[PDB]
Design a protein around this ligand. Structure first.
Ligand code: THR
Length: 344
């Protein structure tokens, strides 16, 4: 079924036109973005959108983010746009920021999982914008993965999940940030962070004041998702353990745990910076930015190699690290080992 369009070098418009044609015809198109790859459909066409949920096997109440290329499009999808929304748009769009607002009647309820609110974003990616421009349609698009697998950050990840199952994949290379957009709820004062992501909280806080963090960012079970990445948490075949604390103590803890799970005859994977004696070891990088960029790539490598346990080194809950920790903590099922410097 699928047509793959390599655009990772030059961005020929006639190629993007192929994909834009598929969006118009109510078909599915996977496309790169600065955050992760998205599985897009015409957000105006309710049955096209249904096909996203079906392809992914995604719960109907996990809503979808609508991608736009101009600000006049936000006016069509939302009503009651507050001023703090305009400030954030002006400063951070196009960018890894998603706003939740009151929806207008033009947004089908299948996008919003039944709710009166809609999640909108203007992606900072030439390919994603050009597709939206040439489709002349707003594009509904969660992450382009089978529900339960990790998010995709390259067209390889998309293809291993959906090649032959969806109409089109646009390959624009590995995504630069690597974790999903940040989501702010501007449906109430004060605003509330629903999902930490590509735009760090400190940045947002320079523009609008301090904001509330929704308890979902820290694990708490939510039964209604106002935004994606809040309620579901299949995002694995392996036990995942996160080790947090001072570096030298974490690395020592991981060492004991590799031995322990090998003693139980199990295949051990480790993600982090230390040198370890494991079956599989992915080096994620020195900085938090590099970590976010390689996170999902790493987790997909661990699922491919069929390791029984994944041991991850924590990172500082700061900059991109709030997000990388949030996604790790949602994958391991918050199985965290905290090691401390002793005070006696
Ligand atoms: C696909 C990508 O745009 C994703 N929905 C995000 O918000 O990061």
């Amino acid at each position: 079924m699928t047509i793959i369009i390599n655009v990772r070098e030059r961005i020929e418009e006639w190629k993007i036109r192929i994909a834009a044609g598929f969006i118009r015809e109510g078909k599915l198109v996977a496309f790169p973005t600065e955050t992760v790859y998205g599985l897009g459909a015409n957000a105006l066409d309710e049955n096209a959108v249904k096909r996203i949920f079906e392809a992914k096997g995604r719960p109907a109440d996990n809503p979808l983010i609508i991608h736009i290329a101009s600000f006049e499009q936000l006016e069509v999808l939302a009503k009651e746009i507050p001023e703090e929304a305009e400030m954030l748009a002006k400063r951070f769009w196009p960018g890894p920021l998603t706003l939740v607002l009151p929806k207008s009647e033009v947004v089908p309820r299948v996008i919003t999982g039944g709710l009166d609110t809609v999640a909108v974003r203007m992606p900072a990616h030439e390919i994603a914008l050009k597709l939206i421009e040439l489709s002349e349609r707003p594009i509904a698009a969660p992450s382009a993965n089978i529900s339960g697998k990790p998010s995709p950050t390259s067209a390889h990840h998309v293809a291993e999940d959906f090649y032959g199952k969806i109409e089109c994949i646009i390959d624009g290379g590995e995504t630069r940030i690597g974790v999903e957009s940040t989501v702010i709820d501007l449906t109430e004062w004060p605003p509330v962070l629903l999902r930490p992501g590509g735009l760090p909280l400190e940045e947002i806080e320079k523009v609008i004041g301090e904001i509330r963090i929704h308890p979902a960012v820290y694990g708490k079970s939510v039964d209604t998702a106002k935004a994606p990445g809040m309620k579901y948490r299949a995002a694995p075949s392996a036990e995942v353990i996160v080790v947090e604390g001072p570096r030298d103590k974490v690395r020592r803890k991981i060492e004991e745990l590799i031995a322990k799970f090998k003693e139980e005859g199990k295949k051990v994977g480790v993600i982090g910076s230390g040198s370890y004696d494991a079956d599989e070891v992915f080096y994620l990088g020195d900085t938090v930015e590099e970590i976010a960029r390689n996170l999902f790539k790493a987790l997909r490598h661990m699922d491919r190699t069929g390791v029984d346990v994944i041991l991850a080194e924590g990172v500082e809950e700061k900059g991109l690290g709030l997000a990388v920790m949030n996604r790790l903590r949602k994958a391991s099922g918050y199985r965290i080992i905290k090691v401390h410097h002793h005070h006696h």
